[PDB]
Amino acid sequence: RDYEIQRERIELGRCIGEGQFGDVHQGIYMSPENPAMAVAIKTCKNCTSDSVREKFLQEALTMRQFDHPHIVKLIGVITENPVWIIMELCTLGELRSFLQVRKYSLDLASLILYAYQLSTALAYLESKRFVHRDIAARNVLVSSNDCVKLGDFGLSRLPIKWMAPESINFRRFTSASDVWMFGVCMWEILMHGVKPFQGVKNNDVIGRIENGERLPMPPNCPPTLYSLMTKCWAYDPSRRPRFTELKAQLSTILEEEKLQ
Numbered sequence: 001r002d003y004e005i006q007r008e009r010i011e012l013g014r015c016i017g018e019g020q021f022g023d024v025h026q027g028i029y030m031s032p033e034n035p036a037m038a039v040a041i042k043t044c045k046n047c048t049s050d051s052v053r054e055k056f057l058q059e060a061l062t063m064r065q066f067d068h069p070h071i072v073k074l075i076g077v078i079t080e081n082p083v084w085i086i087m088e089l090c091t092l093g094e095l096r097s098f099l100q101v102r103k104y105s106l107d108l109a110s111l112i113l114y115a116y117q118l119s120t121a122l123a124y125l126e127s128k129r130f131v132h133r134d135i136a137a138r139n140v141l142v143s144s145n146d147c148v149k150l151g152d153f154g155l156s157r158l159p160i161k162w163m164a165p166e167s168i169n170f171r172r173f174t175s176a177s178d179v180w181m182f183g184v185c186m187w188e189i190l191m192h193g194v195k196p197f198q199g200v201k202n203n204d205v206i207g208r209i210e211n212g213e214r215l216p217m218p219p220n221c222p223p224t225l226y227s228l229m230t231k232c233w234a235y236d237p238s239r240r241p242r243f244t245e246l247k248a249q250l251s252t253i254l255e256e257e258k259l260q
């Protein structure tokens with residue numbers, strides 16, 4: 001059982017970014033016999049108290065519950081100071097950069113695959129009654145060309161243009177508001193890592209959305225798919241599909257794309 005890893009099994013590599021609690025490094029988990037595996041190591045800033053430590057480690061506690069091919073995998077924790085969380089490394093990095101950089105080398109079928117894969121992770125999370133609250137390409141990682149994984153999972157310490165009307169207006173976050181965000185995430189993927197509502201102010205966004213305005217159909221996005229996206233953006237959350245539906249729809253759209 002035990003998620004506690006001995007610190008000498010970890011070789012800290014280069015800083016690859018920042019979480020809310022501190023720096024994230026790439027690195028290696030070493031074990032006897034045993035090829036050696038690339039890991040992400042999340043660190044914590046100024047946690048000179050239990051409370052900050054407890055908040056930071058909650059991410060690990062949350063990820064203990066999940067076992068999915070398209071969700072970042074927790075490997076372990078080191079709970080004596082400095083406290084670290086060890087995760088699997090998604091070696092190709094952040095989705096947006098990957099999409100931007102590989103625009104002329106990715107076919108439409110790959111973009112749909114990523115959407116389908118993310119929807120299986122989200123249908124999984126739905127069944128655990130886990131509300132993610134920030135589904136956006138910034139939180140998707142690339143493990144390989146044919147594999148993406150969803151991250152955080154962790155706590156703080158507002159993503160207006162990704163959020164459902166009911167999340168913005170009534171601080172409501174549910175499975176249906178996550179579906180809305182997934183729709184925007186799919187727009188980002190089809191758009192190759194372009195941000196929704198560029199040059200638009202956050203306080204403008206709810207005005208436009210309640211006036212019925214929606215993100216336009218991406219060039220070379222199939223109609224059946226933009227049709228699925230628009231259903232994610234139904235104002236009335238009770239009419240949006242659930243991730244179980246989306247997973248089955250994205251499957252047929254993907255398969256019809258690989259069939260020409």
Ligand SMILES: CN[C@@H]1CCN(C2C=C/C(=N\c3ncc(Cl)c(Nc4ccccc4S(=O)(=O)NC(C)C)n3)C(OC)=C2)C1
Binds near residue numbers: 015024087088091
């Ligand atoms: C932009 N500068 C960096 C240079 C290379 N970068 C990355 C980013 C992610 C990355 N892969 C990760 N794989 C797993 C995990 Cl948990 C991970 N975590 C993060 C890396 C960087 C910043 C934040 C995280 S995070 O706190 O776990 N949250 C992410 C979902 C954004 N990265 C890379 O693998 C080599 C390289 C970006």
